[PDB]
Design an enzyme around this catalytic site. Structure first.
Site, PDB file in Angstrom:
ATOM      1  N   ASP A 197      -5.659  -0.643   5.134  1.00 30.75           N
ATOM      2  CA  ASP A 197      -4.044  -0.450   4.918  1.00 30.75           C
ATOM      3  C   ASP A 197      -3.526  -0.437   6.089  1.00 30.75           C
ATOM      4  OD1 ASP A 197      -4.151  -0.009   1.994  1.00 30.75           O
ATOM      5  OD2 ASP A 197      -4.897   1.763   1.972  1.00 30.75           O
ATOM      6  N   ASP A 227     -10.532  -1.240   0.932  1.00 25.77           N
ATOM      7  CA  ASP A 227      -8.957  -1.652   1.434  1.00 25.77           C
ATOM      8  C   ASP A 227      -8.730  -1.277   2.755  1.00 25.77           C
ATOM      9  OD1 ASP A 227      -9.419  -3.100  -1.133  1.00 25.77           O
ATOM     10  OD2 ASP A 227      -8.186  -1.281  -2.092  1.00 25.77           O
ATOM     11  N   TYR A 233       8.369   0.054  -2.377  1.00 22.21           N
ATOM     12  CA  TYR A 233       8.845   1.414  -2.320  1.00 22.21           C
ATOM     13  C   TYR A 233       9.167   2.081  -0.766  1.00 22.21           C
ATOM     14  CZ  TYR A 233       4.197   3.507  -3.037  1.00 22.21           C
ATOM     15  OH  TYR A 233       2.818   3.849  -2.944  1.00 22.21           O
ATOM     16  N   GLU A 284      -0.453  -1.041   8.483  1.00 20.30           N
ATOM     17  CA  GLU A 284       1.177  -1.096   8.326  1.00 20.30           C
ATOM     18  C   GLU A 284       1.843  -1.478   9.861  1.00 20.30           C
ATOM     19  OE1 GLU A 284       1.624   2.589   5.887  1.00 20.30           O
ATOM     20  OE2 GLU A 284       2.061   1.211   4.300  1.00 20.30           O
TER      21      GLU A 284
END
Lengths: 538, 63
Positions: free
Chosen positions: A256, A254, A333, A258
Protein backbone atom coordinates in the site's frame (compact mmCIF):
# COMPACT_ATOMS: atom_id res chain seq x y z
CA UNK A 1 -42.23 5.53 -3.21
CA UNK A 2 -45.81 6.74 -3.94
CA UNK A 3 -47.68 7.51 -0.61
CA UNK A 4 -46.28 4.72 1.69
CA UNK A 5 -45.19 4.30 5.36
CA UNK A 6 -42.62 2.35 7.48
CA UNK A 7 -42.12 1.87 11.28
CA UNK A 8 -39.00 1.96 13.64
CA UNK A 9 -37.47 -0.66 15.98
CA UNK A 10 -38.30 0.01 19.73
CA UNK A 11 -34.59 -0.52 20.70
CA UNK A 12 -31.25 -0.63 18.81
CA UNK A 13 -29.63 -3.46 20.88
CA UNK A 14 -28.74 -0.98 23.69
CA UNK A 15 -25.93 -2.81 25.57
CA UNK A 16 -23.66 -1.24 28.32
CA UNK A 17 -21.58 1.68 27.06
CA UNK A 18 -23.27 4.72 25.39
CA UNK A 19 -25.91 5.50 28.07
CA UNK A 20 -23.05 6.13 30.59
CA UNK A 21 -20.47 7.22 27.90
CA UNK A 22 -22.54 10.40 27.23
CA UNK A 23 -21.00 12.04 30.38
CA UNK A 24 -17.30 11.07 29.79
CA UNK A 25 -14.74 13.90 30.23
CA UNK A 26 -14.05 14.85 26.54
CA UNK A 27 -17.34 13.80 24.77
CA UNK A 28 -18.24 17.34 23.45
CA UNK A 29 -21.16 16.07 21.27
CA UNK A 30 -23.81 18.79 20.74
CA UNK A 31 -26.84 17.30 18.86
CA UNK A 32 -26.78 20.79 17.16
CA UNK A 33 -23.10 20.18 16.02
CA UNK A 34 -19.77 21.57 17.38
CA UNK A 35 -16.03 22.20 16.86
CA UNK A 36 -15.71 19.34 19.46
CA UNK A 37 -12.69 17.41 18.07
CA UNK A 38 -13.43 14.33 20.36
CA UNK A 39 -16.48 12.05 21.10
CA UNK A 40 -16.77 8.30 22.08
CA UNK A 41 -20.33 6.75 21.61
CA UNK A 42 -20.17 2.91 21.21
CA UNK A 43 -21.37 1.07 18.05
CA UNK A 44 -23.74 -1.44 19.82
CA UNK A 45 -26.36 1.15 21.06
CA UNK A 46 -27.64 2.38 17.64
CA UNK A 47 -27.35 -1.17 16.20
CA UNK A 48 -29.92 -2.60 13.66
CA UNK A 49 -27.94 -5.94 13.37
CA UNK A 50 -27.32 -8.27 10.37
CA UNK A 51 -29.69 -10.59 8.42
CA UNK A 52 -29.10 -13.92 6.52
CA UNK A 53 -29.60 -14.10 2.72
CA UNK A 54 -28.95 -16.59 -0.13
CA UNK A 55 -25.18 -16.11 -0.74
CA UNK A 56 -24.77 -16.99 -4.48
CA UNK A 57 -21.25 -15.71 -5.39
CA UNK A 58 -21.72 -14.79 -9.15
CA UNK A 59 -21.58 -10.99 -8.29
CA UNK A 60 -19.00 -8.21 -7.52
CA UNK A 61 -17.35 -9.38 -4.22
CA UNK A 62 -18.35 -7.42 -1.06
CA UNK A 63 -15.20 -7.06 1.08
CA UNK A 64 -13.62 -5.22 4.09
CA UNK A 65 -10.30 -3.83 5.42
CA UNK A 66 -9.44 -3.91 9.20
CA UNK A 67 -7.32 -1.79 11.68
CA UNK A 68 -6.36 -3.00 15.21
CA UNK A 69 -7.57 -0.19 17.60
CA UNK A 70 -11.24 0.81 18.11
CA UNK A 71 -10.70 3.94 20.29
CA UNK A 72 -8.08 5.01 17.66
CA UNK A 73 -5.76 7.83 18.89
CA UNK A 74 -2.17 9.06 18.13
CA UNK A 75 0.49 7.71 20.60
CA UNK A 76 -1.42 4.68 22.02
CA UNK A 77 -1.31 3.31 25.64
CA UNK A 78 -1.49 -0.03 27.53
CA UNK A 79 -4.82 -1.32 28.97
CA UNK A 80 -8.43 -0.55 27.85
CA UNK A 81 -12.11 0.23 28.79
CA UNK A 82 -11.10 3.75 30.09
CA UNK A 83 -10.93 6.58 27.41
CA UNK A 84 -7.27 6.04 26.32
CA UNK A 85 -8.31 2.69 24.78
CA UNK A 86 -11.84 1.11 24.52
CA UNK A 87 -13.33 -1.60 22.22
CA UNK A 88 -16.26 0.69 21.03
CA UNK A 89 -18.45 -2.44 21.57
CA UNK A 90 -16.52 -4.25 18.72
CA UNK A 91 -16.36 -7.83 20.01
CA UNK A 92 -15.60 -10.25 17.10
CA UNK A 93 -18.79 -12.16 18.26
CA UNK A 94 -21.06 -10.25 15.77
CA UNK A 95 -19.01 -11.82 12.90
CA UNK A 96 -18.52 -15.21 14.71
CA UNK A 97 -22.37 -15.59 14.73
CA UNK A 98 -22.52 -14.23 11.10
CA UNK A 99 -19.38 -15.84 9.45
CA UNK A 100 -20.78 -15.27 5.90
CA UNK A 101 -20.78 -11.39 6.37
CA UNK A 102 -17.89 -10.73 3.83
CA UNK A 103 -16.54 -12.32 0.61
CA UNK A 104 -12.94 -11.24 1.54
CA UNK A 105 -11.15 -9.59 4.50
CA UNK A 106 -7.92 -7.49 4.28
CA UNK A 107 -5.73 -7.45 7.42
CA UNK A 108 -3.06 -4.82 8.41
CA UNK A 109 0.03 -4.85 8.84
CA UNK A 110 3.82 -5.66 9.08
CA UNK A 111 6.77 -3.32 9.71
CA UNK A 112 10.10 -3.45 7.80
CA UNK A 113 13.64 -3.45 9.31
CA UNK A 114 15.20 0.04 8.87
CA UNK A 115 11.79 1.53 7.80
CA UNK A 116 11.40 4.76 9.80
CA UNK A 117 8.12 5.30 7.83
CA UNK A 118 6.15 2.80 9.97
CA UNK A 119 8.04 3.89 13.15
CA UNK A 120 11.78 4.78 13.70
CA UNK A 121 11.85 3.71 17.41
CA UNK A 122 9.23 1.37 19.08
CA UNK A 123 8.84 -1.16 16.19
CA UNK A 124 12.67 -1.07 15.90
CA UNK A 125 12.72 -2.06 19.66
CA UNK A 126 10.74 -5.22 18.62
CA UNK A 127 13.51 -5.64 15.95
CA UNK A 128 16.13 -5.13 18.74
CA UNK A 129 14.08 -7.90 20.45
CA UNK A 130 14.51 -10.29 17.47
CA UNK A 131 18.21 -9.33 17.14
CA UNK A 132 18.78 -10.32 20.83
CA UNK A 133 16.41 -13.28 21.51
CA UNK A 134 17.01 -15.01 18.11
CA UNK A 135 20.80 -15.66 18.60
CA UNK A 136 20.00 -16.79 22.20
CA UNK A 137 17.56 -19.33 20.60
CA UNK A 138 20.25 -20.11 17.90
CA UNK A 139 17.91 -18.47 15.30
CA UNK A 140 19.16 -15.82 12.76
CA UNK A 141 19.13 -12.07 13.37
CA UNK A 142 17.43 -10.13 10.53
CA UNK A 143 18.73 -7.16 8.46
CA UNK A 144 17.09 -4.07 6.85
CA UNK A 145 14.22 -4.86 4.42
CA UNK A 146 12.99 -7.94 6.45
CA UNK A 147 9.36 -7.86 7.75
CA UNK A 148 8.78 -7.43 11.54
CA UNK A 149 5.74 -7.74 13.92
CA UNK A 150 4.22 -4.51 15.31
CA UNK A 151 3.16 -5.32 18.92
CA UNK A 152 3.79 -8.99 20.01
CA UNK A 153 1.72 -8.64 23.25
CA UNK A 154 -1.24 -6.88 21.51
CA UNK A 155 -0.94 -9.21 18.44
CA UNK A 156 -0.49 -12.64 20.18
CA UNK A 157 -0.51 -12.09 24.03
CA UNK A 158 -4.08 -10.68 24.52
CA UNK A 159 -7.34 -12.79 24.63
CA UNK A 160 -10.36 -10.42 25.37
CA UNK A 161 -12.79 -9.12 22.60
CA UNK A 162 -11.15 -11.38 19.87
CA UNK A 163 -13.71 -14.18 20.62
CA UNK A 164 -11.34 -16.37 22.74
CA UNK A 165 -12.02 -18.10 26.14
CA UNK A 166 -10.40 -16.15 29.09
CA UNK A 167 -7.64 -18.70 29.93
CA UNK A 168 -6.10 -18.27 26.35
CA UNK A 169 -4.34 -15.08 27.68
CA UNK A 170 -0.48 -15.39 27.48
CA UNK A 171 1.47 -12.61 29.30
CA UNK A 172 5.11 -13.67 28.46
CA UNK A 173 5.09 -12.21 24.88
CA UNK A 174 7.15 -9.02 25.58
CA UNK A 175 10.12 -7.71 23.45
CA UNK A 176 12.79 -10.01 25.07
CA UNK A 177 10.88 -13.37 24.73
CA UNK A 178 8.46 -13.58 21.73
CA UNK A 179 10.06 -15.22 18.60
CA UNK A 180 9.05 -18.88 19.51
CA UNK A 181 5.33 -17.87 19.17
CA UNK A 182 5.83 -16.53 15.60
CA UNK A 183 3.94 -19.25 13.58
CA UNK A 184 0.30 -20.36 12.92
CA UNK A 185 0.69 -23.41 15.27
CA UNK A 186 0.83 -20.84 18.21
CA UNK A 187 -1.87 -18.44 16.83
CA UNK A 188 -3.56 -16.25 19.50
CA UNK A 189 -5.22 -12.81 19.86
CA UNK A 190 -6.97 -11.64 16.67
CA UNK A 191 -4.54 -13.89 14.67
CA UNK A 192 -6.35 -16.76 16.47
CA UNK A 193 -9.89 -15.32 15.85
CA UNK A 194 -9.26 -14.93 12.07
CA UNK A 195 -7.96 -18.57 11.77
CA UNK A 196 -10.93 -19.74 13.87
CA UNK A 197 -13.36 -17.89 11.54
CA UNK A 198 -11.85 -19.47 8.38
CA UNK A 199 -12.63 -22.94 9.85
CA UNK A 200 -16.14 -22.02 11.17
CA UNK A 201 -17.25 -20.48 7.84
CA UNK A 202 -16.23 -23.74 6.05
CA UNK A 203 -17.78 -25.90 8.85
CA UNK A 204 -21.25 -24.28 8.32
CA UNK A 205 -20.74 -24.04 4.51
CA UNK A 206 -18.53 -21.81 2.31
CA UNK A 207 -14.95 -20.40 2.62
CA UNK A 208 -13.36 -16.95 3.28
CA UNK A 209 -10.53 -15.15 1.40
CA UNK A 210 -7.85 -13.41 3.58
CA UNK A 211 -5.40 -10.75 2.29
CA UNK A 212 -2.96 -8.49 4.23
CA UNK A 213 -1.56 -4.91 3.88
CA UNK A 214 2.01 -3.52 4.25
CA UNK A 215 2.38 0.32 4.31
CA UNK A 216 0.09 3.39 3.99
CA UNK A 217 -0.20 7.22 4.12
CA UNK A 218 2.56 7.87 6.74
CA UNK A 219 3.96 4.31 6.23
CA UNK A 220 5.85 4.47 2.86
CA UNK A 221 9.47 5.57 3.66
CA UNK A 222 11.80 2.59 2.98
CA UNK A 223 9.87 1.54 -0.21
CA UNK A 224 12.30 3.92 -2.07
CA UNK A 225 15.27 1.91 -0.60
CA UNK A 226 13.60 -1.55 -0.96
CA UNK A 227 12.38 -1.34 -4.60
CA UNK A 228 15.44 0.53 -6.00
CA UNK A 229 18.22 -2.04 -5.35
CA UNK A 230 18.39 -5.92 -5.21
CA UNK A 231 20.27 -6.03 -1.85
CA UNK A 232 17.13 -4.82 0.00
CA UNK A 233 14.74 -6.84 -2.30
CA UNK A 234 16.45 -10.20 -1.42
CA UNK A 235 15.98 -9.80 2.38
CA UNK A 236 12.38 -8.65 1.84
CA UNK A 237 11.37 -11.46 -0.62
CA UNK A 238 13.04 -14.04 1.66
CA UNK A 239 10.97 -12.55 4.56
CA UNK A 240 7.70 -12.88 2.52
CA UNK A 241 8.62 -16.55 1.82
CA UNK A 242 9.41 -16.94 5.57
CA UNK A 243 6.01 -15.33 6.43
CA UNK A 244 3.99 -17.79 4.25
CA UNK A 245 6.16 -20.65 5.69
CA UNK A 246 5.17 -19.42 9.24
CA UNK A 247 1.52 -18.52 8.41
CA UNK A 248 -0.05 -20.44 5.41
CA UNK A 249 -3.70 -19.32 6.19
CA UNK A 250 -3.30 -15.98 4.31
CA UNK A 251 -4.19 -16.00 0.56
CA UNK A 252 -2.78 -12.63 -0.61
CA UNK A 253 -0.23 -9.83 0.18
CA UNK A 254 -0.54 -6.18 -0.99
CA UNK A 255 1.92 -3.24 -0.81
CA UNK A 256 0.00 0.00 0.00
CA UNK A 257 2.59 2.59 -1.19
CA UNK A 258 1.11 6.17 -1.22
CA UNK A 259 2.14 7.09 -3.96
CA UNK A 260 4.14 5.99 -7.11
CA UNK A 261 4.22 9.74 -7.86
CA UNK A 262 4.59 11.48 -4.43
CA UNK A 263 1.24 11.21 -2.56
CA UNK A 264 1.61 10.74 1.21
CA UNK A 265 3.27 12.32 4.27
CA UNK A 266 6.82 13.90 4.20
CA UNK A 267 8.11 10.79 6.13
CA UNK A 268 7.45 8.79 2.89
CA UNK A 269 10.18 8.77 0.17
CA UNK A 270 9.85 8.59 -3.67
CA UNK A 271 11.96 9.20 -6.78
CA UNK A 272 10.20 9.46 -10.20
CA UNK A 273 12.02 6.13 -11.04
CA UNK A 274 10.41 4.32 -8.02
CA UNK A 275 7.16 4.15 -10.11
CA UNK A 276 9.16 1.70 -12.32
CA UNK A 277 11.22 0.15 -9.40
CA UNK A 278 7.83 -0.98 -7.90
CA UNK A 279 7.15 -3.01 -11.13
CA UNK A 280 10.54 -4.74 -10.66
CA UNK A 281 9.91 -5.32 -6.89
CA UNK A 282 6.49 -6.98 -7.53
CA UNK A 283 7.72 -9.07 -10.55
CA UNK A 284 10.73 -10.34 -8.52
CA UNK A 285 8.37 -11.25 -5.62
CA UNK A 286 5.79 -12.85 -8.04
CA UNK A 287 8.66 -14.97 -9.51
CA UNK A 288 10.00 -16.07 -6.06
CA UNK A 289 6.46 -16.89 -4.78
CA UNK A 290 5.63 -18.80 -8.04
CA UNK A 291 8.94 -20.69 -7.48
CA UNK A 292 8.22 -21.57 -3.79
CA UNK A 293 4.39 -21.99 -3.73
CA UNK A 294 3.59 -23.14 -7.33
CA UNK A 295 0.26 -22.32 -9.08
CA UNK A 296 -2.60 -24.60 -7.81
CA UNK A 297 -2.62 -22.68 -4.45
CA UNK A 298 -0.58 -19.47 -5.21
CA UNK A 299 -0.87 -16.21 -3.17
CA UNK A 300 -2.56 -13.21 -4.88
CA UNK A 301 -1.09 -9.70 -5.58
CA UNK A 302 -3.12 -6.44 -6.08
CA UNK A 303 -2.56 -2.61 -6.05
CA UNK A 304 -4.03 0.51 -4.39
CA UNK A 305 -4.71 3.01 -7.23
CA UNK A 306 -5.35 6.75 -6.82
CA UNK A 307 -8.82 8.01 -7.87
CA UNK A 308 -7.20 11.31 -9.13
CA UNK A 309 -6.77 11.55 -12.93
CA UNK A 310 -3.12 12.73 -12.95
CA UNK A 311 -2.06 10.12 -10.32
CA UNK A 312 -3.67 7.07 -12.00
CA UNK A 313 -1.15 7.89 -14.82
CA UNK A 314 1.76 7.88 -12.26
CA UNK A 315 0.34 4.57 -10.85
CA UNK A 316 1.62 3.01 -14.17
CA UNK A 317 -0.99 0.15 -14.40
CA UNK A 318 -0.42 -0.12 -18.20
CA UNK A 319 3.05 -1.61 -17.42
CA UNK A 320 1.99 -3.73 -14.36
CA UNK A 321 -0.72 -5.43 -16.53
CA UNK A 322 2.19 -6.97 -18.56
CA UNK A 323 4.42 -7.81 -15.48
CA UNK A 324 1.72 -9.64 -13.36
CA UNK A 325 -1.16 -8.09 -11.35
CA UNK A 326 -4.40 -9.79 -10.18
CA UNK A 327 -6.67 -6.85 -9.15
CA UNK A 328 -6.79 -3.00 -9.15
CA UNK A 329 -8.29 -1.22 -6.11
CA UNK A 330 -9.94 2.13 -6.87
CA UNK A 331 -9.52 4.03 -3.55
CA UNK A 332 -11.56 6.96 -5.03
CA UNK A 333 -12.12 8.69 -1.62
CA UNK A 334 -10.58 11.51 0.51
CA UNK A 335 -11.79 14.01 -2.17
CA UNK A 336 -12.71 16.11 0.92
CA UNK A 337 -11.39 16.45 4.50
CA UNK A 338 -12.26 18.86 7.32
CA UNK A 339 -9.19 21.21 7.31
CA UNK A 340 -7.21 21.09 4.01
CA UNK A 341 -9.78 22.38 1.42
CA UNK A 342 -10.66 26.18 1.34
CA UNK A 343 -14.43 25.38 1.12
CA UNK A 344 -16.90 22.68 2.34
CA UNK A 345 -17.13 19.50 0.17
CA UNK A 346 -17.72 15.71 -0.07
CA UNK A 347 -15.44 12.65 0.72
CA UNK A 348 -16.35 11.29 -2.76
CA UNK A 349 -19.63 10.73 -4.77
CA UNK A 350 -21.07 8.85 -7.82
CA UNK A 351 -21.40 12.01 -10.08
CA UNK A 352 -19.35 15.30 -10.20
CA UNK A 353 -21.43 18.59 -10.20
CA UNK A 354 -19.72 19.36 -13.57
CA UNK A 355 -16.07 20.27 -12.86
CA UNK A 356 -13.38 19.89 -10.04
CA UNK A 357 -13.88 23.56 -8.88
CA UNK A 358 -10.51 25.40 -8.42
CA UNK A 359 -8.80 22.22 -9.89
CA UNK A 360 -8.96 20.90 -6.27
CA UNK A 361 -9.68 17.43 -4.78
CA UNK A 362 -13.33 18.58 -4.17
CA UNK A 363 -16.08 18.28 -6.86
CA UNK A 364 -14.48 14.99 -8.10
CA UNK A 365 -16.44 11.67 -8.38
CA UNK A 366 -16.13 7.91 -9.03
CA UNK A 367 -17.62 8.46 -12.57
CA UNK A 368 -14.36 10.17 -13.69
CA UNK A 369 -11.73 7.39 -13.18
CA UNK A 370 -13.24 4.23 -14.83
CA UNK A 371 -13.97 6.13 -18.10
CA UNK A 372 -10.16 6.52 -18.51
CA UNK A 373 -9.02 3.24 -16.85
CA UNK A 374 -11.23 0.85 -18.93
CA UNK A 375 -10.39 2.60 -22.26
CA UNK A 376 -7.11 4.63 -22.25
CA UNK A 377 -5.46 2.04 -19.91
CA UNK A 378 -7.72 -0.79 -21.35
CA UNK A 379 -8.38 -2.42 -17.91
CA UNK A 380 -11.01 -5.22 -17.36
CA UNK A 381 -13.73 -4.11 -14.87
CA UNK A 382 -13.34 -7.62 -13.31
CA UNK A 383 -9.86 -6.52 -12.04
CA UNK A 384 -11.23 -3.17 -10.81
CA UNK A 385 -12.67 -3.04 -7.26
CA UNK A 386 -14.50 0.02 -5.79
CA UNK A 387 -13.37 1.29 -2.36
CA UNK A 388 -15.64 3.33 -0.05
CA UNK A 389 -15.52 4.79 3.51
CA UNK A 390 -18.02 3.77 6.29
CA UNK A 391 -18.07 7.29 7.91
CA UNK A 392 -18.82 11.02 7.34
CA UNK A 393 -16.65 14.19 6.97
CA UNK A 394 -17.45 17.36 8.98
CA UNK A 395 -16.98 21.14 8.45
CA UNK A 396 -18.02 24.43 10.21
CA UNK A 397 -19.01 28.06 9.35
CA UNK A 398 -20.66 26.64 6.17
CA UNK A 399 -23.02 28.45 3.79
CA UNK A 400 -24.64 26.42 0.98
CA UNK A 401 -24.72 29.24 -1.67
CA UNK A 402 -20.94 30.06 -1.29
CA UNK A 403 -19.28 27.00 0.47
CA UNK A 404 -17.00 29.31 2.58
CA UNK A 405 -15.55 27.52 5.66
CA UNK A 406 -14.01 28.61 9.03
CA UNK A 407 -10.41 28.29 7.71
CA UNK A 408 -8.92 26.42 10.76
CA UNK A 409 -12.03 24.97 12.56
CA UNK A 410 -11.59 21.20 13.43
CA UNK A 411 -15.32 20.26 13.23
CA UNK A 412 -16.89 17.41 15.28
CA UNK A 413 -16.33 13.69 14.76
CA UNK A 414 -15.83 10.38 16.65
CA UNK A 415 -12.53 9.36 18.35
CA UNK A 416 -9.89 12.22 18.33
CA UNK A 417 -9.24 14.61 15.35
CA UNK A 418 -11.11 11.96 13.20
CA UNK A 419 -14.40 11.48 11.24
CA UNK A 420 -18.01 11.16 12.65
CA UNK A 421 -19.59 7.66 12.15
CA UNK A 422 -23.19 7.16 10.91
CA UNK A 423 -24.48 5.35 14.08
CA UNK A 424 -23.67 8.44 16.31
CA UNK A 425 -25.23 10.60 13.51
CA UNK A 426 -28.56 8.61 13.53
CA UNK A 427 -28.41 8.74 17.39
CA UNK A 428 -28.42 12.59 17.36
CA UNK A 429 -28.90 14.37 13.96
CA UNK A 430 -30.81 12.13 11.50
CA UNK A 431 -34.16 10.27 10.91
CA UNK A 432 -34.06 6.46 10.35
CA UNK A 433 -37.53 5.98 11.94
CA UNK A 434 -40.53 7.90 10.38
CA UNK A 435 -41.10 7.61 6.55
CA UNK A 436 -38.94 10.60 5.34
CA UNK A 437 -35.15 11.18 4.91
CA UNK A 438 -34.63 14.30 7.14
CA UNK A 439 -32.76 15.71 10.19
CA UNK A 440 -33.91 15.79 13.89
CA UNK A 441 -33.06 17.72 17.14
CA UNK A 442 -32.51 20.82 14.86
CA UNK A 443 -30.27 19.30 12.10
CA UNK A 444 -31.36 19.28 8.38
CA UNK A 445 -30.56 16.83 5.49
CA UNK A 446 -29.65 18.30 2.08
CA UNK A 447 -29.27 16.92 -1.51
CA UNK A 448 -27.11 18.80 -4.07
CA UNK A 449 -29.06 19.57 -7.35
CA UNK A 450 -25.66 19.57 -9.21
CA UNK A 451 -23.94 16.31 -8.00
CA UNK A 452 -27.06 14.58 -6.41
CA UNK A 453 -25.09 13.54 -3.24
CA UNK A 454 -26.59 14.10 0.31
CA UNK A 455 -25.15 16.02 3.34
CA UNK A 456 -26.30 17.09 6.85
CA UNK A 457 -26.38 20.79 7.82
CA UNK A 458 -27.28 23.04 10.83
CA UNK A 459 -28.50 26.68 11.18
CA UNK A 460 -26.33 27.91 14.10
CA UNK A 461 -22.83 29.24 12.99
CA UNK A 462 -22.89 26.52 10.24
CA UNK A 463 -22.13 22.85 11.18
CA UNK A 464 -21.88 20.64 8.04
CA UNK A 465 -21.44 16.83 7.66
CA UNK A 466 -20.82 15.04 4.36
CA UNK A 467 -22.16 11.42 4.80
CA UNK A 468 -23.43 8.25 3.02
CA UNK A 469 -27.05 6.97 3.39
CA UNK A 470 -29.09 3.74 2.99
CA UNK A 471 -30.41 5.36 -0.28
CA UNK A 472 -26.99 5.98 -1.84
CA UNK A 473 -25.58 2.58 -0.71
CA UNK A 474 -28.73 0.81 -2.11
CA UNK A 475 -27.86 2.66 -5.38
CA UNK A 476 -23.99 2.17 -5.34
CA UNK A 477 -24.48 -1.65 -5.12
CA UNK A 478 -26.91 -1.77 -8.12
CA UNK A 479 -24.52 0.60 -9.97
CA UNK A 480 -21.45 -1.59 -9.14
CA UNK A 481 -23.30 -4.76 -10.27
CA UNK A 482 -24.12 -3.14 -13.70
CA UNK A 483 -20.59 -1.58 -13.88
CA UNK A 484 -19.07 -5.11 -13.96
CA UNK A 485 -16.56 -4.74 -11.06
CA UNK A 486 -14.48 -7.54 -9.55
CA UNK A 487 -15.82 -6.20 -6.21
CA UNK A 488 -16.52 -3.44 -3.66
CA UNK A 489 -14.71 -2.78 -0.33
CA UNK A 490 -15.43 -1.22 3.09
CA UNK A 491 -13.00 0.80 5.25
CA UNK A 492 -12.79 -0.12 8.23
CA UNK A 493 -15.09 -3.13 9.04
CA UNK A 494 -15.33 -2.36 12.84
CA UNK A 495 -17.39 0.83 12.09
CA UNK A 496 -20.86 -0.61 11.14
CA UNK A 497 -23.31 -2.44 13.48
CA UNK A 498 -25.43 -3.09 10.33
CA UNK A 499 -26.86 0.27 9.05
CA UNK A 500 -25.13 0.42 5.60
CA UNK A 501 -23.82 -3.21 5.46
CA UNK A 502 -27.43 -4.55 5.30
CA UNK A 503 -28.00 -1.92 2.53
CA UNK A 504 -24.90 -3.25 0.65
CA UNK A 505 -26.24 -6.89 0.46
CA UNK A 506 -29.67 -5.42 -0.44
CA UNK A 507 -27.89 -3.17 -3.05
CA UNK A 508 -25.92 -6.04 -4.68
CA UNK A 509 -29.17 -8.16 -4.77
CA UNK A 510 -28.66 -10.85 -2.09
CA UNK A 511 -32.19 -11.96 -0.95
CA UNK A 512 -34.51 -14.22 1.11
CA UNK A 513 -38.37 -14.51 0.82
CA UNK A 514 -35.83 -8.71 8.86
CA UNK A 515 -34.49 -6.61 11.79
CA UNK A 516 -35.47 -3.27 10.02
CA UNK A 517 -36.68 -2.01 6.55
CA UNK A 518 -36.25 1.31 4.74
CA UNK A 519 -38.54 1.82 1.63
CA UNK A 520 -39.98 5.30 2.60
CA UNK A 521 -36.41 6.00 3.97
CA UNK A 522 -34.82 5.71 0.45
CA UNK A 523 -36.45 9.06 -0.62
CA UNK A 524 -33.98 12.06 -1.04
CA UNK A 525 -33.33 15.26 1.06
CA UNK A 526 -33.79 19.06 0.49
CA UNK A 527 -32.86 19.96 -3.14
CA UNK A 528 -30.16 22.67 -2.55
CA UNK A 529 -28.07 24.41 -5.28
CA UNK A 530 -24.62 23.58 -3.77
CA UNK A 531 -22.62 25.21 -6.66
CA UNK A 532 -19.14 24.00 -7.76
CA UNK A 533 -16.52 26.67 -6.83
CA UNK A 534 -16.51 27.59 -10.60
CA UNK A 535 -20.29 28.28 -10.17
CA UNK A 536 -19.41 30.47 -7.08
CA UNK A 537 -16.70 32.37 -9.11
CA UNK A 538 -19.17 32.83 -12.06
CA UNK B 1 -15.35 -22.69 32.18
CA UNK B 2 -17.45 -25.39 30.37
CA UNK B 3 -20.05 -22.94 28.98
CA UNK B 4 -17.26 -21.41 26.77
CA UNK B 5 -17.45 -24.70 24.80
CA UNK B 6 -21.31 -24.96 24.80
CA UNK B 7 -21.57 -21.36 23.37
CA UNK B 8 -19.78 -22.34 20.05
CA UNK B 9 -19.56 -26.16 19.92
CA UNK B 10 -23.40 -25.95 20.15
CA UNK B 11 -23.44 -22.52 18.39
CA UNK B 12 -22.09 -23.88 15.05
CA UNK B 13 -19.63 -26.83 15.32
CA UNK B 14 -22.09 -29.68 16.13
CA UNK B 15 -25.93 -29.50 16.54
CA UNK B 16 -25.69 -31.94 19.51
CA UNK B 17 -23.38 -34.53 21.16
CA UNK B 18 -25.55 -37.24 19.44
CA UNK B 19 -24.19 -36.07 16.03
CA UNK B 20 -20.64 -36.99 17.24
CA UNK B 21 -21.81 -40.53 16.18
CA UNK B 22 -20.37 -39.37 12.76
CA UNK B 23 -16.73 -39.29 13.84
CA UNK B 24 -13.49 -41.22 14.01
CA UNK B 25 -10.92 -39.92 16.57
CA UNK B 26 -8.36 -38.42 14.13
CA UNK B 27 -11.22 -36.56 12.27
CA UNK B 28 -12.40 -35.08 15.61
CA UNK B 29 -8.89 -34.27 16.99
CA UNK B 30 -7.82 -32.34 13.79
CA UNK B 31 -10.54 -29.61 14.08
CA UNK B 32 -9.76 -28.21 17.59
CA UNK B 33 -7.42 -25.41 18.92
CA UNK B 34 -5.46 -25.49 22.26
CA UNK B 35 -8.51 -24.03 24.17
CA UNK B 36 -10.45 -27.22 23.16
CA UNK B 37 -7.64 -29.79 22.57
CA UNK B 38 -5.89 -28.92 25.90
CA UNK B 39 -9.25 -29.84 27.65
CA UNK B 40 -10.74 -32.33 25.12
CA UNK B 41 -8.52 -35.48 24.78
CA UNK B 42 -10.75 -37.26 27.43
CA UNK B 43 -14.07 -36.57 25.57
CA UNK B 44 -14.52 -39.75 23.46
CA UNK B 45 -14.25 -42.01 26.61
CA UNK B 46 -17.78 -40.69 27.62
CA UNK B 47 -19.10 -38.80 24.51
CA UNK B 48 -19.04 -41.89 22.21
CA UNK B 49 -20.72 -43.57 25.22
CA UNK B 50 -23.31 -40.67 24.94
CA UNK B 51 -23.54 -41.60 21.20
CA UNK B 52 -25.00 -44.98 22.37
CA UNK B 53 -26.89 -43.68 25.56
CA UNK B 54 -30.35 -42.98 23.92
CA UNK B 55 -30.22 -46.52 22.34
CA UNK B 56 -32.97 -48.62 24.13
CA UNK B 57 -35.03 -45.60 25.53
CA UNK B 58 -37.53 -46.25 22.63
CA UNK B 59 -37.18 -50.17 22.61
CA UNK B 60 -37.17 -51.14 26.38
CA UNK B 61 -40.94 -50.41 25.91
CA UNK B 62 -41.41 -53.93 24.23
CA UNK B 63 -44.32 -54.50 26.68
Amino acid sequence: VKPTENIPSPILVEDKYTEETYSRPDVNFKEDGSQGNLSYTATRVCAPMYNHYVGDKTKPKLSAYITDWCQYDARLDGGGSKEEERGRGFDLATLMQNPATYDRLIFSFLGICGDIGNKSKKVQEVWDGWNAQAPSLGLPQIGKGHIVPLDPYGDLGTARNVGLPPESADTSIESGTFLPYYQQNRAAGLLGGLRELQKKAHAMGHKLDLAFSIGGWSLSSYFSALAENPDERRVFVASVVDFFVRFPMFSCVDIDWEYPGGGGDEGNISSDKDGENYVLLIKELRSALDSRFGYSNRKEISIACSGVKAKLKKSNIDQLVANGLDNIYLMSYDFFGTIWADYIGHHTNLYSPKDPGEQELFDLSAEAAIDYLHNELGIPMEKIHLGYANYGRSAVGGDLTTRQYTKNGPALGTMENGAPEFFDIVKNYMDAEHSLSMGKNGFVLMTDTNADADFLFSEAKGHFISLDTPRTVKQKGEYAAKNKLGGVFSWSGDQDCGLLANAAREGLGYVADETIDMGPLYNPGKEIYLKSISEIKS
Amino acid sequence: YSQSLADTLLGLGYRSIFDIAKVSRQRFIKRHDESLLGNGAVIFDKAVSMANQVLQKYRKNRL
